[model samples]
Target: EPFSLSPIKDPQALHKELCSKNVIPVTSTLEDLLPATQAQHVFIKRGTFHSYNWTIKGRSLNMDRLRETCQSLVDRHSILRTSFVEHEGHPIQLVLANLDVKVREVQCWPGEDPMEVCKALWDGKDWPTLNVLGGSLPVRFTLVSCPGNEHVVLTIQISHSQWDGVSIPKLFSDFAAIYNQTPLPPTSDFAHYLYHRVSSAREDVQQDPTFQFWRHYLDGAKMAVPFAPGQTLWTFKGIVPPTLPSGITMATLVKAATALFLSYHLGSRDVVFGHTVNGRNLPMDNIESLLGCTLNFVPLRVTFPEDSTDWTVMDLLHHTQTQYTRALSHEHVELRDIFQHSTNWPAETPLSLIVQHQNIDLSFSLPLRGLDVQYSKFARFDPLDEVWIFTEPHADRLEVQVCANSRVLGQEQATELANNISAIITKFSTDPTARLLDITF
Candidate 1:
């Protein structure tokens, strides 16, 4: 029998039913501050396409089989079939039919660069407008075909309000398993997860310490940052450079950057860079797996030197490591709670500068079978300006992608910052004796 696509029964009615239960938008706080920044949409743009090339050393993949698996996964995940609907003053996920899930296969010309081809696919500005579904979610997948090497690069972009990194991987894993015809593993229920998380949130303002702290901190707090007079341009650029044979770990580089940002921006003797950690380290049960935003964002606060001294940079780096160890012990704190306690709930916080460490090998398991995979390369597409240092280590070398809000800094300044960061990382890896002052921007 051929496969058929249909929406869940009375999804609109179901969404309306859920809305009356006091469901809040995923980023309720952020929405309050930036009234225009709708939590209904998750916007991500790639300045440069994520390009991967590998010879089909094993066997040629069957495109037909791959398509079948993609359809099956989409059918299983109700969220993929969902669109947003407002009911009772809150937006809820309305599961709809005909999401237009398809495995688009494009044959490329001989000797064509897959990356360049992918870039062309994204070159048209109309694609986003055409693909975007009515303030809700339009099309979910944007793929580019590479011609020569029997290898393909796929870019999966989704609305942030709907899913997070944890849920994304699970989606891919399920798709892969189904495509390969492998026995599908038991997965958690998303609906139950959502119910539990929202239910756990304290409604009694008197009892919750975190909520109390948030109210106190935000009371009469200003939301604006006084801007220093300067021309700012928003732009993004990415590069994948040759890997260093053996280099300093991400831990070292992050510490170096933390020291630099603190010394230059904040004159305080004790400067701390808040390191955001994802809480997926724990086991993924049904509840854990289904919860949309299960990750925790923690701060790794480090104190710097009162005066610039010998190896001040190295000293700062070491201090960052110590702070990270301390933060790990308290990873149990929910990020929502922290924000609720924070004085700067909606405004920009020191948590702006983020360092993310990712390893592909650590993520995937063996079982090279049928797989329909969609990879999401996280990018900054919102108005909130911040600097993010993302590190992904591959088999060959370490690749770092820096995503920043152009409104906060100009393109030249952003590029300079990235270059300066790269230099610091290189020096720390190459020369143990290199002092902080010796490092040049």
Candidate 2:
């Protein structure tokens, strides 16, 4: 028998309903999709961060209502009902035939953290079938009922495969709207993105200048300098006034500082580093609401003037803006493909340092069923190849998190470099044309 098309008006009955049964071919634009990456995909080493675990404490989180809301979400978005399956040795995201996300209730063992139970993937999903759900759909929730059912702890775990920085806010915002009996913008549908990533591989078109630029920039770059992963980390913060001069923007300026940050820290005017971008800016209705990952980490090449003493920070800023614009134009292409065209890029060291200017929602206030999320502990599974510095703008101030192993760079050195990045930002704000050398760490 076919899946039900009729409305299940009763919330409890909706939880028992299956999603619209349909499976479409989806090619993965996930990272390099290399054998190595996919081979060890699900193995989260001990002491290493993997999945995002969110805990909410509240009085009586109505599992019935919560399940009803979540089931509806999975029904609406194809990605939510999605799972990855390999056919002929190639990964294809299967829009499963009977996808249903279940909220498995957990009765924690004596003296055990319910969240830990949620974190324990014990026999969960892994590659080459990188299912977002071990045996379910996209999202899984575990509700822990304390001895006195008055208060409960809810924990959510989403696979890093399907969600990234941009995915969380949109998911919860829609979730909030759903639970509050409100409304949300229409979903653009992640299925639409399935085709854009295929055009280049189709071999029907010539190499555009955008692709050519990356090839040239990479080929012209110097040999990669490796930093041994540190045993510890150091961090600092900075600010960027919302206001900017004529041509400067947060995107351009922060990247300029990124170039300077690496140049000064590594003591080299010639620098190339990883620049992470939200790869979902394609022009599509409700593109912002797509429920999946579109995060891309591409290389940004910056070569300072031979004589920094003669160049202004604004000069570098303008140049960085130009570089970033060109990169963004062709961000849809994978990083590995972009560098493969350049003979100079080595196979051993694909990337080194990463710079991400995270655009966070500070004004967003989510009171999930009257449960105010005490605090969020967010981190990604370190891909273990490079150091990442995530600088976020918050309340007229910039907050930065530098995740670098002490072995790759000393704790003290990383701290000072972070401070220097902030210092350069303030300097450029006041004196756009200040000598780049003056701010060079």
Candidate 3:
């Protein structure tokens, strides 16, 4: 009975008695379950197919330096060394000691396109095991040698669990600093983050109104969640508007525009969609800059009164911003936990339309004195959703991408939706004073 709750009798004795028993690992977070459960959370058959990829080329792209960087990263972050081991019914991430997850190389035939060869390798090679504890490192690497000293193509792929949009830029930034032997930036503990997130919500978690909010929001909600019967979720990607006007955050405009896009399809004044937020804003530590998964999808609802009132782009943007402000106030509250903890829902929920905003500046150089690098297009894959809108900072313009599943919509529908969304933004940018009532979708 003493072990039922706290085995240690005294609070101070708790620290000393820690060695009396093996500590159970922290359970996987909602963010972790969201993807792995789905293959199925961002779902690419749950393969490394959805991995964040980079093709590094610089004759001086030292294989050893690459290995060293990966080793250094694994050594530095507990999350890097962390692996998911199966429990009775769930996978828990257990941090293990140093694993030999270093870079390895390959050689291609003389006339083969390096890029083509890389694709060939991907097709032939079996994708690494997923969610299996005590397996290989999450880091996967391949180096292809070109004819003579012309060029060497280095391909790097990392899972979403290890890498994400919010942390990637910082990862690369720190990667460069670490390789160059520069000052190491401040780092936070992922283990610490796990306990902080789960424990902080314990006291008032049940007494809070968060569960009721989602239950009501998702009640009878026809989100058109994916892999539905019939047609697959193949999508004709969307077009990016040429420019974004001043006085608006790119995120606000993109989210509002996507909501506007969906408003037409769902045929309603009120639209709710899943939005991905960097869930790093906790009072725990410098989680803002920590090297771990602090990202998850939360709902954003946009409303427009169907009265005679005309809504302008500025008005929508401001409204979207306000909604976000309210949504994030309790961003720490895991939606998965809410789904289970809530007594209001009749059944499990579905992931509906979603938004993921990232800054894409793939402009960086890898140099080894005289060796110049030719980096391939930084690779990224679409997430699972009825409609997923991705936007990033582009050359003085915002790069907007809209993707959707075929079952939920059609090819023409997708194109029309994107084109209209682009047109809406273009028209608004040209004349910000126009009302939604006056402007046509």
Candidate 4:
């Protein structure tokens, strides 16, 4: 005999309850799918996420209140409770309305430093699986305290699918506000944001003016670069305070330098490489206020003037800014869409290098009255072979960082690349009228 379950008397209320559990089909967005697809296909990998370390200095911290505050913080943002899972053949993000984000406390023994213990936990190879297919949440919180418990350290591990570089400070700011009992303004929904973006991409794929702009922009541009051969992954970090002449931004100068580097390597005036945009310049409401992985990795094509044109470094800088402004108007367009509709290159073409302007203020102080909250460390693990060049700004100086897959570029090669960019920036800062081709490393 077959047993029948009870029927729902209020179907409308049941539908309303289900609607509260926001689910977004995310197969169309590369920001979510790149990490999600890689995680889904790989066998138990670590370092697919970003981890932030914070040290809060105060005496006799209340653990229970901290726990409650964290829980409430998760409750405030739907993205915090988001999990990516494979539904049938597609990837989808599920936002659970209610889930406990417990702050697991680890106590350090006498004579043991809490910072060391925090590192041990991270290095223990015992990170909770963040794979959504395995029913894991996208976020993890751990608290470490010394024997006296005068000061504590907090570690936040969030998946790359959920957060980007810009989201770190926003997370801390919101956390501090919530913990301090300060009311946060209303936030827009992540599900709706993704839906609008994906739907518009689908609807306007053929008629998007950005597609035409890209097609014409990259008509004769080379799509990839040759990597210097090696085997592991390494990064060369350097700081250079290149003096910027009036009316020039750090990003514009860096792009000129990077494009110049590419021109030298590729032996061509036209060079194309990947660059990331923050993806916050959309027309949507509260987009800047929302937090998530809104970074779009798009190709940037920088073409220099002909050798006979006698263009100066200042001309190149102005051209870079002009291209950036043109692209900024359509920066919200998805990378995949650009590949599919704008260019003739295969959608799977791998970028040999990516340039990112790391301008996020890493020094924002968390507003906790007595607790000296400071950012201790930030970590991201990517197993790709693509090179990343980050140009950062600091008070009285600028920093240039080159991270390359050791297989694609050796230590000396990466260091030389960074030095070359630094030198170019130095020249541009001092003399804008210097001949572009005359500039040397």
The lDDT leader among the candidates is 4
lDDT by residue (tens digit), candidate 4, 33-136: 11232222221132456567778778746666667778887777767776655535435454555466768788878877777787777666435433445435
TM-score, one value per model? 0.61, 0.73, 0.76, 0.85
Let me know the TM-score candidate 2 reaches against the reference structure: 0.73
Write model 3 residue lDDT over 1-441, tens digit each, in one string. Answer: 111222223422332232233321122111221112221134322332332334444545555676677667666666666444333433444444424554666666787777777765555552433433332345556666776534666666555656555666666666666666678767875656666665556466556656555555455444433455324333333344434556566677777777777777677787767887777777776676676666677767788767577778778878887777665646655556656665343334655666777743546544333255555533334433356666666555565566654656677876676667666666666676667767677
lDDT of 1 at 299: 51
List lDDT for all candidates, in order: 0.47, 0.58, 0.56, 0.67
Per-candidate Cα RMSD to the true structure, in Å, reads: 9.0, 8.4, 7.0, 7.0
Tens digit of per-residue lDDT, candidate 2, span 1-441: 112211222322222222222222122112111111221132222122233334556674666777777767666665665544433443444344344556767666566765555445432432223333222343455566555443455544555555556766776667757776787767854555545455434452236655576666666676457844435465776666535668877767777887887776577877887777777766555656687667777778788878825998788988988777766667766565666554445433456677788765644344676464543433334335557777777776777667766667666877876777777677777878677766644
**Tens digits of lDDT, candidate 1, 129-171:** 4322333343355334455424655444445444555565676
Which portions of model 3 show Cα errors greater than 4 Å? 1-62, 85-90, 108-114, 126-136, 146-150, 208-247, 339-343, 360-370, 377-385
Our model 1 lands, by Cα RMSD against the true structure, at 9.0
lDDT of 3 at 254: 71
Report clash pairs, candidate 3: 35-41, 38-41, 39-43, 39-46, 233-405, 233-406
How much is 393 displaced in model 3, in angstroms? 3.0
